[PDB]
């Protein structure tokens, strides 16, 4: 059907839009603190503290697998990155502060992304 292709044209172009967005958010973490998942061999109790671990490499796999069916899904993952860190790592750590800054710098990007999603459809 021509109808299913048109939704596939739409998901494809979304994934292209979100690929730009992700690249912008990852530019706001120049330390690459949120680049890969938190190793379990290096932090063995981590999963006792955090229930849904999340990172930029993991969000990228799901993207190229056209796994994000809206911006809300995409936002929830990014917030986990931030929120899981700000639970695990205390106030006076480079890790905590790295998510606080990312969150603040990411909200500019994610504001204009919401306007492009709606406008384009």
């Amino acid at each position: 059907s021509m109808e299913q292709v048109a939704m596939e044209l739409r998901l494809t172009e979304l994934t292209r839009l979100l690929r730009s967005v992700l690249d912008q958010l990852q530019d706001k973490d120049p330390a690459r603190i949120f680049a890969q998942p938190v190793s379990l061999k290096e932090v063995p109790d981590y999963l006792d503290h955090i229930k849904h671990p999340m990172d930029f490499a993991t969000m990228r796999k799901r993207l190229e697998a056209q796994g994000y069916k809206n911006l809300h899904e995409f936002e929830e993952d990014f917030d986990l990155i931030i929120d899981n860190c700000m639970k695990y790592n205390a106030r006076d750590t480079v890790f905590y502060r790295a998510a606080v800054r990312l969150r603040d710098q990411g909200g500019v990007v994610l504001r204009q992304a919401r306007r492009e999603v709606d406008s384009i459809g």
Side-chain angles (χ1 to χ4, degrees), residues 14 19-20 24 37-38 43 59 63-64 73-74 77 82 84 88 93 97 101-102 105 109 118-119:
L14 168 67
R19 194 175 306 126
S20 180
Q24 291 173 58
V38 171
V43 187
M59 287 190 75
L63 189 68
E64 294 311 309
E73 284 183 17
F74 183 86
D77 269 25
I82 297 306
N84 291 331
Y88 199 82
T93 65
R97 290 159 184 277
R101 294 166 57 77
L102 180 50
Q105 302 191 270
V109 174
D118 299 325
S119 180

Side-chain angles (χ1 to χ4, degrees), residues 8 14 38 48 53 56 70 72 82 103 112 114-115 118:
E8 289 152 42
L14 168 67
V38 171
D48 304 338
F56 286 131
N70 55 48
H72 188 69
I82 297 306
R103 187 195 59 187
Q112 198 62 32
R114 171 51 61 191
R115 299 187 67 83
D118 299 325

Side-chain angles (χ1 to χ4, degrees), residues 29-40 42-60 62-68 70-88:
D29 182 49
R32 305 187 76 84
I33 293 159
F34 307 111
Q36 295 289 326
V38 171
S39 190
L40 308 176
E42 296 199 330
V43 187
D45 67 30
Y46 192 78
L47 298 185
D48 304 338
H49 292 269
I50 297 305
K51 298 303 177 177
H52 298 96
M54 194 46 59
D55 57 275
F56 286 131
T58 298
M59 287 190 75
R60 198 167 295 288
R62 176 164 172 181
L63 189 68
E64 294 311 309
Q66 304 188 319
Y68 286 118
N70 55 48
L71 176 59
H72 188 69
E73 284 183 17
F74 183 86
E75 283 182 326
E76 288 193 358
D77 269 25
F78 173 71
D79 296 308
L80 287 172
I81 295 165
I82 297 306
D83 297 351
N84 291 331
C85 180
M86 292 171 70
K87 287 174 195 65
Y88 199 82

